[PDB]
Amino acid sequence: QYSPNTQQGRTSIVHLFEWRWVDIALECERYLAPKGFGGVQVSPPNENVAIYNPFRPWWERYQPVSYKLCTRSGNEDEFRNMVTRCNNVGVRIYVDAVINHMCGNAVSAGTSSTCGSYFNPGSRDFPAVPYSGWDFNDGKCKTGSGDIENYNDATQVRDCRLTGLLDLALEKDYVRSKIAEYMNHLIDIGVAGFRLDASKHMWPGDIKAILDKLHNLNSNWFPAGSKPFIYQEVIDLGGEPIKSSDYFGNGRVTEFKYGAKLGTVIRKWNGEKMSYLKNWGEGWGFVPSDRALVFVDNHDNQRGHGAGGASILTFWDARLYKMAVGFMLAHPYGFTRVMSSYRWPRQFQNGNDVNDWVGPPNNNGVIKEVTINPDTTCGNDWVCEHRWRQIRNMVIFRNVVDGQPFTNWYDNGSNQVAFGRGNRGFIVFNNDDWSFSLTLQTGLPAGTYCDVISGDKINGNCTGIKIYVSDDGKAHFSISNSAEDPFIAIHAESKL
């Protein structure tokens, strides 16, 4: 469950947050496959509650009604068509599995669901599954509100309602079977793995029992014996009873300390600076690299809806974001997930964004198609960070240097740092308020390399900055603290 099951080479997955299945299918064929992306995190594919107050917020998809593959992203056939077309071009699909709970206990009963299934939170009836009052933790939860009240009590965190979401009795074989039935349907369809939503709220052992029910990946696309990739969403920072290491027996875990600390370092908060990143990784209290799913921001915290808080960097801080994603894609630590979002009417007051609920670009509730502009950027308000040159090229950079060790580190004791990956790649950063001009050991073979941040290698020539590596591997780099992108990256495949 620790291997992402990507084709040989592919080292990253992209979160196409709220994209429709038909759009992801096309993206697999037109961009993801040729650019070297490993897979796609799709939003929950199961039927959810249609919430109109506020109007169709993104979070309504973490409020399950049934396991029918029927949502604003598409129906069961469109989903299947997506997995098939993506697998055929070597791009995997990872499902965001919302299995800890059903919808909010106070949501009104009826057919206000993405597939019209009837459900009654109050009587705890979800006939489309079916689930009844016997399948929820009402009796088990010991808090006065029935909701989670204190995170210092690991039991309550697992047995009570996360912000009121009806909590499934995951210890019951009936519930484990219903969930495995849903996950096996997706696996047999071609899905390569899952994001286990709210894993902190599930007992490591209940997750284990459910995983024991899962099949091996579809043998038409995957090697025999392939176990689905599993990454547990567990927000574990400082002091609290639950540790993400408690889930290592089930697969990887989201390392929320990663984006949080990379954000404070890049923002230079509390005296932090890039020179400190020399021991980036476990040295920072992070989980072991082979158990980490890393990212700069995720759909939640990019809205201030999660771990990391204010330090989290997003597409809104484009300049620094590209830098952060660049360091992440160049560093060997963990398995990288690139965020891809949509622009929303972010409006702050008294410090909080009152529009952080806004769902994806839509027309009367119907999610808008992703349109590709002539310059390869997206329209319809989709940000498509994965299409940004500096990010897509670092995605390729990661593939090129895969397996190569972290080496040849340099820092000026402040914010000008650089490092290489074996003799396959080299990257340099300048985040100080002054220019950086110096000759560094790159560990790369002599020659002329195209800097993939400022440009591309095309038709045997460079469109941007060019770096010359001498016979001893040394090369001169010059970065103005005013440069559009204050960092340079060169690798074996951008060599002329």
Ligand SMILES: C[C@H]1O[C@H](O)[C@H](O)[C@@H](O)[C@@H]1N[C@H]1C=C(CO)[C@@H](O[C@H]2O[C@H](CO)[C@@H](O[C@H]3O[C@H](CO)[C@@H](O[C@H]4O[C@H](CO)[C@@H](O)[C@H](O)[C@H]4O)[C@H](O)[C@H]3O)[C@H](O)[C@H]2O)[C@H](O)[C@H]1O
């Ligand atoms: C949110 C995080 O809280 C901790 O930090 C956990 O440790 C962590 O695991 C979790 N993050 C994961 C899990 C959930 C939960 O479903 C998702 O939260 C996402 O989906 C939730 C459910 O729709 C959202 O809740 C929001 O919507 C719910 C209903 O739609 C509301 O229920 C409330 O109103 C409903 C009616 O309107 C009622 O029926 C319900 O009983 C009542 O509790 C919550 O009060 C509200 O905050 C949440 O705002 C969003 O971020 C995240 O995307 C996912 O990353």
Ligand SMILES: *[C@H]1O[C@H](CO)[C@@H](O)[C@H](O)[C@H]1NC(C)=O
């Ligand atoms: C790269 O471009 C230059 C012109 O900018 C041209 O002279 C050169 O021959 C090109 N290289 C190749 C390999 O086509």
Ligand SMILES: O=N[O-]
């Ligand atoms: O999986 N990211 O929360």
Ligand SMILES: [Ca+2]
């Ligand atoms: Ca639970």
